[PDB]
């Protein structure tokens, strides 16, 4: 009836032309209004193969989130070893909005509703939709923010878990609030999180993790090395780049409920769209603040003989960030 | 014309740190993980870790953490390995090695298709020392440091030079079996 | 996390013969395995990737097989350039190595007299590799005060050679050599 195929998806968002948010401006030019009533047809007695790691929908969501950044967050000067660029650098309003990815005629999207699918393999309870759920293009590292949350229990997703060179996406199932603020070292900011809520998460997952290993103890430690983007929970909030220090989130002793993360606001950043540095104008005046929901984690397991298996926060290609939401989906040609 | 080239042999004393270089050519440096692997004399291979040159991300073998640091400089296609707080048994030849496939291919990355030439180290309390050469009525080339030494007979006109052994003194000794043996120890500029 | 065991420890054959090398993964579930050849003082060379694919520049006489826990490297006909040490590898993990040797001699034994005295015993061009050197000083068996080393197999006769060094009180210095090619131990002395 259908085959795995590739083509040109299209995006859909509930974006008003009234708004000045940069994300909205981009959507109004490249997305169509969300179909109001979506008709999804579960398919009885069917099983379909899925590989989140070979999914070309990601490749497209990548291109698009680059697109927004290209217009949404223009750097004053961006440096590569081929090219130097200096240009207009305005500050813009900035709030990520969900994005849906629909299929044109001749094609449809298949979704895996199994609450525990790892992302590579067949799926018993498969449905069919004309458009993904709405995914907020959050760019972040170590911690996955504002995503979807696992329906029932924690899910560990990797291509080859024995390969210590492959990202480990973790989809939590109980979110954890995080509040990051720069108030009005003077580019210093901070985040607050509930130790108890975070530790509870760290355990539910450290428990889930030994399930994939034989009678091995689990440990959490800070990153082994890398650019500040990797070695910190890095992100943008209000067009400002926070780099926050998760040494108090990745530890085998989890402190009091409220724990405080030192952050710093950077004008120079190593780019994820490309290999280079982008320089940005200093932070705007004001109380820049961002309450976020941690929905998943990115991690890496130390290799080499160990009696403990250690995991460390890992930034990765952003695509992984898209993978975390586009795991459930595939593209079929009728 | 893919090439990987490493810094020259280095000799350091116990308790010190070392930084080995690995200069890459013939490909996009950020496109491929560079791993590090070492080899004790006559022994197997021991993997040390890998680095992602796009991001700087690392993974280290648990055996050494905080004794080893891996880095990159994308501007000069060069990877670096730093091993601190050296033990005598860290004496080994060090190789860097590239996976066959680009990170973007996401396939099985641990097929080491390209290797550097290796970097010989020596963790020792010993100091450079020329050999004494005694006749085997061959020649016994005793009490030198570090490796290596070369031996010829009759200036190359007479064509078994044995592998050296490491004595408890920390100095090497080897044997090679008118007859004249020409012994050269470059580190000490000795020629007998 | 995983251990690799290759067997045998040493493989001795002749050109034209079929070569089979085994690598057994301990408890492993992966199906990826690479094979490497190494010659002395040289970098390893990747022979086979992903278990069953020949690397570029590798001759057709090399084959890989296996999945699961037991894997095989096959060389249809040994050539002179094919004798070397062989490693398997999976993920970050390496096997202990297999030495592939030319299979084919009693040693010729020589003793050399010397604040220090070094006495040297030479065993020249013998096969097989197994050999025993015993130092005797005034007919007393020595222990703890000698070191030895052995050459790589000779490129012309495939033999090994061995040098042992023992490092005024005593009169008779002897090296006694035992080897299968000798119907009884040979003693060289001064
Ligand atoms: C994850 O999603 C939440 C929303 O569900 C994001 O929170 C939003 O954060 C932005 C600032 O980062 C807020 O916009 C700002 O609001 C203040 C006060 O209203 C205003 O002075 C600024 O000009 C700007 O408009 C937004 O109100 C807030 N929304 C909610 C519901 O809290 C959060 O930032 C997201 N996380 C990441 C990493 O993007
Ligand atoms: C920059 O990278 C290019 C290839 O991407 C390379 O050819 C060039 O040598 C690099 N520039 C340097 C070495 O500074
Ligand atoms: C999440 O899943 C874990 C097991 O993986 C379970 O212990 C926990 O109760 C779940 N939380 C919620 C809110 O369902
Ligand atoms: C995080 O904080 C710890 C101590 O609070 C510090 O040692 C470490 O260098 C910091 N890491 C980063 C990436 O700032």
Numbering used by the authors:
A (entry chain G): 44 to 124, 198 to 300, 325 to 393, 409 to 461, 464 to 491
B (entry chain H): 1 to 52, 52A, 53 to 82, 82A, 82B, 82C, 83 to 99, 99A, ...
C (entry chain L): 1 to 104, 107 to 116, 124 to 176, 183 to 205
Task: Please share text taken word for word from the publication where this structure appeared.
Compared with mature NIH45-46 (NIH45-46MAT), NIH45-46GL contained 40 HC and 23 LC substitutions in addition to a two-residue insertion in CDRL1. Crystal structures of NIH45-46GL bound to 426c.TM1△V1-3 and 3BNC60GL bound to 426c.TM4△V1-3 were solved to 3.4 Å and 3.1 Å resolution, respectively. Similarly, NIH45-46GL Thr58HC makes an additional side chain hydrogen bond with Gly365gp120. We previously noted slight differences between bound and unbound NIH45-46MAT in the conformations of CDRs L1 and H3 and positions of the Tyr89CDRL3 and Tyr74FWRH3 side chains, but the counterpart residues in NIH45-46GL were not affected by gp120 binding.
The HIV-1 envelope (Env) spike, a trimer of gp120-gp41 heterodimers, is the only target of neutralizing antibodies (Abs). Two forms of designed gp120-based immunogens were subsequently engineered to bind and activate germline HC/LC VRC01-class B cell receptors: gp120 outer domain-only constructs (eOD-GT6 and eOD-GT8) (Jardine et al., 2013; 2015) and gp120s modified from the clade C 426c Env (McGuire et al., 2013; 2014; 2016).
